[PDB]
Amino acid sequence: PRPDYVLLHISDTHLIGGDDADDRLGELLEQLNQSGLRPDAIVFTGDLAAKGEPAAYRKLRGLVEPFAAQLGAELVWVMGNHDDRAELRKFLLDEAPSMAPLDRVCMIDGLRIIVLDTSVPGHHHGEIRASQLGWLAEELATPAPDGTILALHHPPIPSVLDMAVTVELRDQAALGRVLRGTDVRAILAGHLHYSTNATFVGIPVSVASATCGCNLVHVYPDTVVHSVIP
Amino acid sequence: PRPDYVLLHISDTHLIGGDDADDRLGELLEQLNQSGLRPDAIVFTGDLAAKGEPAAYRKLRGLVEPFAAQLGAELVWVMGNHDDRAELRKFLLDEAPSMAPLDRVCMIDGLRIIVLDTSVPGHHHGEIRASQLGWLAEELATPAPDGTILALHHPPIPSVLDMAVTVELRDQAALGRVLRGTDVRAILAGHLHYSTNATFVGIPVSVASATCGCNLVHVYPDTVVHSVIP
Numbered sequence A, B: 001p002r003p004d005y006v007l008l009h010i011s012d013t014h015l016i017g018g019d020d021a022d023d024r025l026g027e028l029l030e031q032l033n034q035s036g037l038r039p040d041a042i043v044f045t046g047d048l049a050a051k052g053e054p055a056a057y058r059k060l061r062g063l064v065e066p067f068a069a070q071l072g073a074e075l076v077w078v079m080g081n082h083d084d085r086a087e088l089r090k091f092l093l094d095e096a097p098s099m100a101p102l103d104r105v106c107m108i109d110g111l112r113i114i115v116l117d118t119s120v121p122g123h124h125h126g127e128i129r130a131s132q133l134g135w136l137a138e139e140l141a142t143p144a145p146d147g148t149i150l151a152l153h154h155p156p157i158p159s160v161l162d163m164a165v166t167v168e169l170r171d172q173a174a175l176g177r178v179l180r181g182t183d184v185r186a187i188l189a190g191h192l193h194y195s196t197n198a199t200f201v202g203i204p205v206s207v208a209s210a211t212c213g214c215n216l217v218h219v220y221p222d223t224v225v226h227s228v229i230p
């Protein structure tokens, strides 16, 4: 059975200035390059840079872009709590610096990938602004031919650890009312630094662990398969 | 947030006669015992013994029962392709030897756990007999207060590897027609020897990797969370 789409789900790389998460990610990219995988997209669900440093984004971009271009894969970057919106826009995206949420829509043929920004500047918990929910609702009003993958950092999933509660995504009910009954087929997330899956308003949520392995995502006609790659 | 139920999902232990999967499982049980976890049930989703040997089941029973009794957890054993129904019944369950499918229902308070046998004696692929589907349909006609966890070996999930196709669960459509619209909240499976999750007729399927880590399952009021424990 050939899947309709193949996605690489990587998260929590936590790169720093430079003096380690650098080598851990290099080895991963090298492994996946030698596996012969040819993904349609590579989605990085947040905490890309450990302290949101400019030097870390330039480093990340230099490691990842040759990898993605060789595979012909689309790159999909997501904000995490440790990232800085302005520095990410400047040094990773080549866009004008802004503190506005990093929200974006990306079509892979018939597959829609929506990037949402659950980060809260200067803070570690997650939250989604009313403006973002309106944006998302408007976007989801039109269905994609192959449905939608939602990509964000803070997963809408109960915190199974005490430590995780204080940095969880807040006000999940509101995101739930927007997502319910839409063509969202899967939610890709990070933040937890261990592999987890659950549903949120009937939609499967898959959290990839930290790089500092990853997940393979096979999109089939009637299901989405997530495989944990150690 | 306290979950309603906590389950331990272990799979593919592959114990042999004795001359290694023995030590790998011992270390796991020891770890989980020192973590302070207190699960309601411990579900083993098949391939318990590598060659279905009597000596392997006695060995498994001797390692696991003291572990389960100390935790006050219910033990839930499932048939895999490498197991032998008769030897498992004799040496693990203290039941009269039979080659009939190992199908069973188990209530944990309001939570129903259904064990299904996807094994095919002498073969490695999975299949479910018409008699079993009738049985299952009849059982699922009455809802459980907290819904149902279905536990089986061969997952109803597309095979993302060529090697896996020839030993996959066959005739999934028929299982699907029975499960659709029931109170089945999650399907626990093994067989793949790596962590995987997907849905099957809208129901989340979680495959635990092989012991030869495991999964923690938190059952919440509105969701089931699966965490991969390396």
Ligand SMILES: C[As](C)(=O)[O-]
Binding pocket: A012, A047, A081, A082, A124, A167, A191, A192, A193
């Ligand atoms: C779990 As964290 C402090 O890397 O967002």
Ligand SMILES: C[As](C)(=O)[O-]
Binding pocket: B012, B047, B081, B082, B124, B167, B191, B192, B193
């Ligand atoms: C994947 As197998 C041969 O242990 O059923």
Ligand SMILES: [Br-]
Binding pocket: A086, A097, A098, A099
């Ligand atoms: Br700015």
Ligand SMILES: [Br-]
Binding pocket: A101, A120, A121, A129
């Ligand atoms: Br904001």
Ligand SMILES: [Br-]
Binding pocket: A103, A104, A105, A106
């Ligand atoms: Br956009």
Ligand SMILES: [Br-]
Binding pocket: A220, A221, A222, A223, B158
């Ligand atoms: Br499918």
Ligand SMILES: [Br-]
Binding pocket: B086, B097, B098, B099
């Ligand atoms: Br017999």
Ligand SMILES: [Br-]
Binding pocket: B101, B120, B121, B129
């Ligand atoms: Br049979």
Ligand SMILES: [Br-]
Binding pocket: B103, B104, B105, B106
């Ligand atoms: Br029964």
Ligand SMILES: [Br-]
Binding pocket: A158, B220, B221, B222, B223
């Ligand atoms: Br819940």
Ligand SMILES: [Fe+3]
Binding pocket: A012, A014, A046, A047, A080, A082, A191, A193
């Ligand atoms: Fe992180």
Ligand SMILES: [Fe+3]
Binding pocket: B012, B014, B046, B047, B080, B082, B191, B193
């Ligand atoms: Fe096995």
Ligand SMILES: [Mn+2]
Binding pocket: A046, A047, A080, A081, A082, A153, A190, A191, A192
């Ligand atoms: Mn985070």
Ligand SMILES: [Mn+2]
Binding pocket: B046, B047, B080, B081, B082, B153, B190, B191, B192
């Ligand atoms: Mn098996």
